[PDB]
Design a protein around this ligand. Structure first.
Ligand SMILES: CC(C)=CCC/C(C)=C/CC/C(C)=C/CCN(C)CCOP(=O)(O)OP(=O)(O)O
Ligand SMILES: [Zn+2]
Lengths: 5, 346, 314
């Protein structure tokens, strides 16, 4: 996963 | 293999419908999930499969409008969702005062962006309120925070600010000179752009920096030719097959857009290897449920489904609209935005 | 106090201490978009969180409620903000909160809200004594965690804790000379302490990097550092570098080395060097070597660089 916030 | 277009259309449709209890951590940023889905359908020219009017009302119910006494201007913009419990109000009546209700820069950005994609004309958007809210978020160093109550500040939000100003076709939302200064100061010794001064340059922040400057129409003015050449070198070195976000890190589908789009804005994406990039992106395609993952044989999500598609778009994949690399919407949508801005000037 | 998975857990709607509060439900209107389905337990905690939030109740029970809301969703920035409001209002023991956030971050090291919370706490306490060790532990599970490095640079700069960082950097580079984050830290430390204008420092660094390159020649990070600390001084101003690199070419060759040479040659052409047309040819020769056999994936890029050199120096 890529958490950008 | 091949691009399973219909499968992805359904994937995005599902995202707009209902999400499993295990996506609760996205609650406060549901609006960006909607953006990934809508913009993704737009990119696949399938917005017809959704009720644009229902969604538009939902989005407007997320707008934080100024109160009667206009005392909450610095807190206007859009919410990520209705998690605060404020009664559903599609930007009709004024604002029902609440101690902790304010907008979030990334939501104001994706919100406006969604409205434009859905065909709305932004007439119900309190432009001045949003711009006032934006201004309040900028720090002395030129960067931005996400909410008036306070948060971390970095390049991600500088890009959000730029997009908002661009879409509202009004840059009074920021002190451009200071933002530009922040962007320049983020340049690393290796020539890429970092989240902030001194930090490791990164594909995500490099995109945010470069894209912001392009949106401001000041790329050439801010960086010298020599500088742009160094940045280009750093960016094109990110391709291994697909793209990674930092030297010596494994590739991830979403960088096919973050870096790819940057390369496009710098006019040298054309010199990258298309086949290996396309092959990598497709290798992360979920042939069963649709969508894309960051890595092959990994679970897909809305973010990678959207960016994987935009990555493919950069190479003009058969079946995918061309993506505007700086605004992060389909060129068609950017065009409609041009008409909108023009229409305003009357 | 009462854990969410305890056999005796009781919904807030069934707790006497909460009888006076009317829960506030979330409503997404007639046609909800990207609606997440919530368990009874989840919705129950948040229906009361909304109630307390809406009334800005600075109570001890609200403080305990945030602990649950956070366990359910640590990414809800509003919950963290409210918890900070309460920490102040109730004048809670911040040293205790430090232990709390320390555990939370270990479980969710990639969450933005938790790192921001810890930074606010350290600012409040003006105490950075636990920071460097805590970060080193996090970097132990992920040596490239961007949040960890960002926090580490903030702590070091804010409380001027430069004394041991260069040694920390040296230790990590030994564990993985390819960690691009550590090379960035090294440049961060040096440029903020001695700087690179001291020829003795520059020489130490250039020599250090060449040693690392010799150990693992195919490492973009090492090469980027070397070029980074010299590019603004002028690469062509170091005549012995050019020949030392040409000497490496035989065995320690890599696309990074070739690229470096091309960049050196270009600097020369940029500074009206002697044997201009000859230098240009040496560059073009390398550009093609990169395109045709050493960095083929960038074939069209290198040829594009070549065309740029010819049309600029002829
Ligand atoms: C909604 C929307 C389109 C927003 C655009 C504005 C933003 C938020 C851009 C974010 C760009 C970006 C990719 C930032 C990096 C985020 N991370 C994942 C940071 C640190 O986590 P790591 O796992 O170490 O990252 P990685 O290893 O992928 O570099
Ligand atoms: Zn990703």
């Amino acid at each position: 996963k890529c958490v950008i916030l | 293999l091949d691009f399973l277009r219909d499968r992805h259309v359904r994937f995005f449709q599902r995202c707009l419908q209902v999400l499993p209890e295990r996506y609760s951590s996205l609650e406060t940023s549901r609006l960006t999930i909607a953006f990934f889905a809508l913009s993704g359908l737009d990119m696949l020219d399938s917005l017809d499969v959704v009720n644009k009017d229902d969604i538009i009302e939902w989005i407007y119910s997320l707008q934080v409008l100024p109160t009667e006494d206009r005392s909450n201007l610095d807190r206007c913009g859009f919410r990520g969702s209705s998690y605060l419990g404020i009664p559903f109000n599609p930007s009709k009546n004024p604002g029902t005062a609440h101690p902790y209700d304010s907008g979030h820069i990334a939501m104001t950005y994706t919100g406006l962006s969604c409205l434009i994609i859905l065909g709305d004309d932004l007439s119900r958007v309190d432009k001045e309120a949003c711009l006032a809210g934006l201004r309040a978020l900028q720090l002395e160093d030129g960067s931005f925070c996400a909410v008036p109550e306070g948060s971390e500040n970095d390049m991600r939000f500088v890009y959000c600010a730029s997009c908002i100003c661009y879409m509202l076709n009004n840059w009074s939302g920021m002190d451009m000179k200071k933002a530009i200064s922040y962007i320049r100061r983020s340049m690393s010794y290796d020539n890429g752009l970092a989240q902030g001064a001194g930090l490791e340059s990164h594909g995500g922040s490099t995109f945010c920096g470069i894209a912001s400057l392009c949106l401001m129409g000041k790329l050439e003015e801010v960086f010298s030719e020599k500088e742009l050449n160094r940045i280009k070198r750093w960016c094109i070195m990110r391709q291994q097959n697909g793209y990674h976000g930092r030297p010596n890190k494994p590739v991830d589908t979403c960088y096919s857009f973050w870096v790819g789009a940057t390369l496009k804005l710098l006019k040298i994406f054309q010199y990258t290897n298309f086949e290996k990039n396309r092959n990598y992106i497709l290798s992360t395609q979920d042939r069963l449920v649709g969508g894309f993952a960051k890595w092959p044989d990994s679970h897909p999500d809305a973010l990678h489904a959207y960016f994987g598609i935009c990555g493919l778009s950069l190479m003009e994949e058969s079946g995918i609209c061309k993506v505007h690399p700086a605004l992060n919407v389909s060129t068609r949508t950017s065009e409609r935005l041009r008409d909108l801005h023009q229409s305003w000037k009357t | 106090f009462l854990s969410l998975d305890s056999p005796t857990y009781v919904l807030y709607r069934d707790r006497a201490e909460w009888a006076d509060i009317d829960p506030v439900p979330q409503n997404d209107g007639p046609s909800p978009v990207v609606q997440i389905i919530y368990s009874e337990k989840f919705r129950d905690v948040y229906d009361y969180f909304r109630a307390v939030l809406q009334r800005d109740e600075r109570s001890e029970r609200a403080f305990k409620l945030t602990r649950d809301a956070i366990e359910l969703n640590a990414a809800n920035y509003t919950v963290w903000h409210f918890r900070r409001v309460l920490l102040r209002s109730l004048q809670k023991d911040l040293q205790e909160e430090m232990n709390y956030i320390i555990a939370i971050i270990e479980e969710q090291p990639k969450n933005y809200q938790v790192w921001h919370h810890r930074r606010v706490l350290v600012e409040w306490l003006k105490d950075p004594s636990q920071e460097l060790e805590f970060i080193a532990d996090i970097l132990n599970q992920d040596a490239k965690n961007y949040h960890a490095w960002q926090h580490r640079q903030w702590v070091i700069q804010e409380f001027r804790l430069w004394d041991n960082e260069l040694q920390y950097v040296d230790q990590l580079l030994k564990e993985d000379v390819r960690n691009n984050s550590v090379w960035n830290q090294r440049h961060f430390v040096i440029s903020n302490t001695t700087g690179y204008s001291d020829r003795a420092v520059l020489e130490r660094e250039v020599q250090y990097t060449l040693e690392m390159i010799k150990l693992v020649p195919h490492n973009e990070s090492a090469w980027n550092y070397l070029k980074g600390i010299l590019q603004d001084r002028g690469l062509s101003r170091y005549p012995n570098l050019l020949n030392q690199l040409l000497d490496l070419q035989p065995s320690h060759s890599s696309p990074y080395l070739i690229a470096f040479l091309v960049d050196i040659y270009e600097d020369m052409l940029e500074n009206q060097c002697d044997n201009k047309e000859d230098i240009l040819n040496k560059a073009l020769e390398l550009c093609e070597i990169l395109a045709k056999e050493k960095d083929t994936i960038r074939k069209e890029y290198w040829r594009y660089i070549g065309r740029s050199l010819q049309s600029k120096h002829s």
